[PDB]
Design a protein around this ligand. Structure first.
Ligand code: 7D2
Ligand code: MG
Length: 533
């Protein structure tokens, strides 16, 4: 039998049932199939014309839903769908909140997937359209947004799955396995360890301080030595240094001379209003009414988005990342990637998602198969198959964040929450990056118990482990936490109670380097209890 709830769903406006169907509307045509798969149903097919904001599924909204923001920093969390209040959106960061901000300013929005107890609805890809859900007058509606682009000939729909089982974590894991297959996900066999400058030195990093850490890093179990934001003269001018830094090429040569894999931060789809590249090439950016469209404001400057539909832009990206590879960099943290997918006017009439994918594909080609790509500030689904690792929460911080709301400002407590709630993408989409461990004992307000809680959770989850500290300031305790963390890697994790609303989670991982383990963590009390077999 079906189920009363399944007879009550609509697929492309028709009553739900298994079959093969054609919708011919005024401005578009859809051909689609509704087919049985393990644990549920798959809706797939093809579309042509001007589909616009295309309705795919409609069903009664659940009371409590696990919602997901489209990008690295945005929350994945359980919300009450009936008492939802639209947020005030910061005009300087509009597009990190939503790629369709008209939705978010009036209704609850979830990107790519949404879950309730016993049921996952999820799209398998975002190659052309942006897939998202909205709660509109008590109804859950799935959409594919094509951003007013027209298609003369058929292109594939992003597939939708509807999965049901009482084990919600199992469904999220299955969903993510299907996403990995649809997109030829990269799941490296080896996970890098390393050092990152950001969460000690921030923009005030000097090359003198960098060299001091490079010598000390020889006593710590680090493979990668990554320079973050600070070295560059302006956003977009990635090969021009400032302050006491040598050349970008010389930085690589010192780092490699000292026995590390050189790593470097860029924001490659972003160019500031002051940069040489923007002032040389005003034509290279996404536009609004013919003029440069602000993508976001950061570093106290307007930042514009590179128009990734333009071959001149893609050639510049190729040559940049080719040059970096020639210098010896083999670890690339590529940040603020949402900029490349902002809605706006481009040279070619392609979607922002199509443009985005051309840009990241160009970066991968340039750095080669032997380079590690870490995505950050990024749309998640469009990057599967391209990146090796991906930041999946908001920034951590050398403090827990007692007065920081769940709003995107840095805080260890909210960074950790996302590592938990997105755990199922790990070893399926890519390697999850939970953000850096901060293990120093001076110049921090983190307690030893908070450092433990953060680090051991990241280990049980088998996530990337990168440390970000002035290494002078890390002593016995910080060293022991890093050692014991690395002992918890290598397993298959599950968060058992993924729909929890009180920030206490039970987490198991099978087959770690320490055997079967279990950690119960409480992000309100700041406590954990870890058992290892
Ligand atoms: O600017 C470097 C910086 C702060 C911005 C971003 O929030 C990223 O997620 C951080 O790890 C840093 O690389
Ligand atoms: Mg693994």
């Amino acid at each position: 039998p079906r189920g009363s709830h399944m007879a009550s769903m609509e697929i492309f406006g028709k009553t739900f049932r298994e079959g093969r169907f054609v919708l011919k509307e005024k401005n578009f045509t859809v051909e689609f199939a509704v087919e049985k798969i393990h644990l549920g149903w798959k809706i797939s097919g093809r579309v042509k014309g001007s589909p616009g904001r295309l309705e795919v599924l409609r069903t009664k909204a659940p009371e409590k839903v696990l919602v997901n923001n489209w990008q690295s920093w945005g929350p994945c969390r359980v919300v009450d769908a009936f008492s939802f209040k639209p947020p005030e959106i910061d005009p300087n960061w509009r597009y990190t909140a939503s790629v369709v901000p008209d939705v978010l300013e009036r209704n609850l929005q979830s990107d790519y997937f949404v879950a309730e107890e016993g049921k996952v609805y999820g799209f398998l890809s975002s190659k052309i359209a942006h897939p998202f859900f909205a709660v509109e007058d008590g109804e859950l509606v799935a959409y594919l947004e094509y951003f007013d682009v027209e298609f003369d000939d058929f292109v594939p729909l992003e597939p939708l799955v509807v999965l049901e089982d009482p084990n919600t974590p199992l469904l999220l894991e299955k969903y993510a396995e299907l996403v990995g297959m649809e997109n030829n996900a990269r799941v490296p066999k080896h996970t890098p360890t390393g050092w990152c400058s950001w969460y000690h030195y921030f923009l005030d990093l000097t090359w003198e301080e960098t060299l001091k850490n490079l010598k000390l890093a020889k006593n710590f179990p680090f493979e990668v030595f990554q320079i973050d934001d600070a070295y560059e003269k302006d956003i977009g001018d990635w090969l021009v240094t400032r302050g006491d830094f040598p050349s970008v090429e010389e930085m690589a040569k010192v780092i490699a001379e000292n026995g590390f894999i050189p790593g470097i931060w860029t924001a490659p789809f972003s160019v500031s209003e002051t940069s040489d590249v923007f002032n040389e090439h005003p034509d290279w950016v996404v536009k609004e009414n013919g003029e440069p469209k602000m993508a976001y404001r950061n570093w106290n400057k307007k930042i514009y988005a590179l128009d990734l539909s333009k071959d001149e832009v893609l050639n510049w990206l190729f040559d940049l990342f080719s040059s970096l590879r020639k210098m010896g960099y083999r670890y690339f943290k590529i940040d603020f990637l949402f900029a490349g997918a902002v809605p706006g006017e481009r040279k070619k009439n392609i979607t922002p998602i199509q443009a985005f994918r051309k840009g990241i594909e160009t970066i991968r080609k340039a750095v080669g198969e032997d380079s590690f790509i870490l995505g950050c500030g990024s749309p998640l689904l469009p990057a599967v198959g391209c990146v090796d690792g991906m930041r999946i929460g908001p920034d951590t911080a050398p403090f827990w964040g007692e007065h920081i709301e769940d709003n995107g400002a840095p805080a260890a407590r909210w960074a950790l929450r996302n590592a938990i709630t997105r755990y199922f993408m790990h070893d399926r989409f890519w390697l999850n990056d939970p953000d850096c461990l901060i293990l120093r004992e001076e110049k921090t307000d983190l307690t030893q118990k908070e450092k433990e809680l953060y680090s051991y959770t990241c280990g049980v989850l088998d996530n990337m482990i990168i440390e970000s500290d002035d290494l002078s300031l890390v002593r016995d305790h910080g060293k022991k936490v890093l050692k014991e963390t690395l002992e918890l890697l290598g397993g298959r994790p599950r968060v058992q109670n993924i729909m929890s609303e009180d920030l206490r989670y039970e987490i198991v991982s099978s087959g770690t380097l320490s055997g079967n383990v279990k950690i119960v963590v409480d992000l309100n009390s700041r406590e954990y209890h870890l058992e290892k077999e």
